[PDB]
Amino acid sequence: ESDIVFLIDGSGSINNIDFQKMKEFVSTVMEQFKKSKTLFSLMQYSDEFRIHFTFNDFKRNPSPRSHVSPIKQLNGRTKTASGIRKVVRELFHKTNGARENAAKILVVITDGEKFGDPLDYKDVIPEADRAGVIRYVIGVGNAFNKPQSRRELDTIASKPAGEHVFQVDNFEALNTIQNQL
């Protein structure tokens, strides 16, 4: 009844402490949906895109520790918008296990500093809206301190953005997501 993709920022601007906090966040969300019919998929992005597991992969082995523990940081630039496009066009597709009539949810974890992306958010966000894709944004690092990165989290998040933008250290993201599903 819900298909949840994580899209995690692994650029070199994410320090190692923050990247581990992304893995722990992801893991805690998956553990909490364990007694439910939720399916998960994850992609890491920088200037390249690695699909760590598809919805089909999770179907066959729904172990958060099996899939999330070996994830290693990619480094490189930050192509968040192209990352969003590749999620809606490939990971939310039945070939990768996505169920029609499930609620589509994308959780983008980033420091809010897109760099090196030939796509702007205006090229990918309206398309994600036209697919059924509800977007949550989890900010790490300095994201909430600068006006540009704050704007970036607002631009990604579905609306009202205050029910979709959260910080990685709190449980508020997972509390809102549980309550909405």
């Epitope: 900010g139 909430f144 301190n145 704050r150 989290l153 607002d154 009202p160 953005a161 205050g162 933008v165 959260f166 910080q167 250290d169 709190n170 508020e172």
Partner: nanobody, 122 residues
Amino acid sequence: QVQLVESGGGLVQAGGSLRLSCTTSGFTFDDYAIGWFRQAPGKEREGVSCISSSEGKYYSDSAKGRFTISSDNAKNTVYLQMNNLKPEDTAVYYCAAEWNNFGRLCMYPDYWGQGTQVTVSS
């Protein structure tokens, strides 16, 4: 019950300075980060500043270097000291409160005051 009451607005010349006050009541003060926002008619809204006991202070690009936000925790009041004011800073200034455990530095306030007018003339 919940109140966020701006004062200290009014007319000042360019180069001048004003101190806004946001006196609050009706909620536990320490549970909220408090910020200032502004809007003139015909102009886009802007965040200005925010203060949180856990996340520190935040300033917009226009505010940074000129403006100082502070909190009198005993009186549940937040001040915005605004120096080097300009005619382009003419706007209705609102204070706002956002639940601090979100950790967002006032990005999406839960409560808003009525706003008070600030006019900057040459």
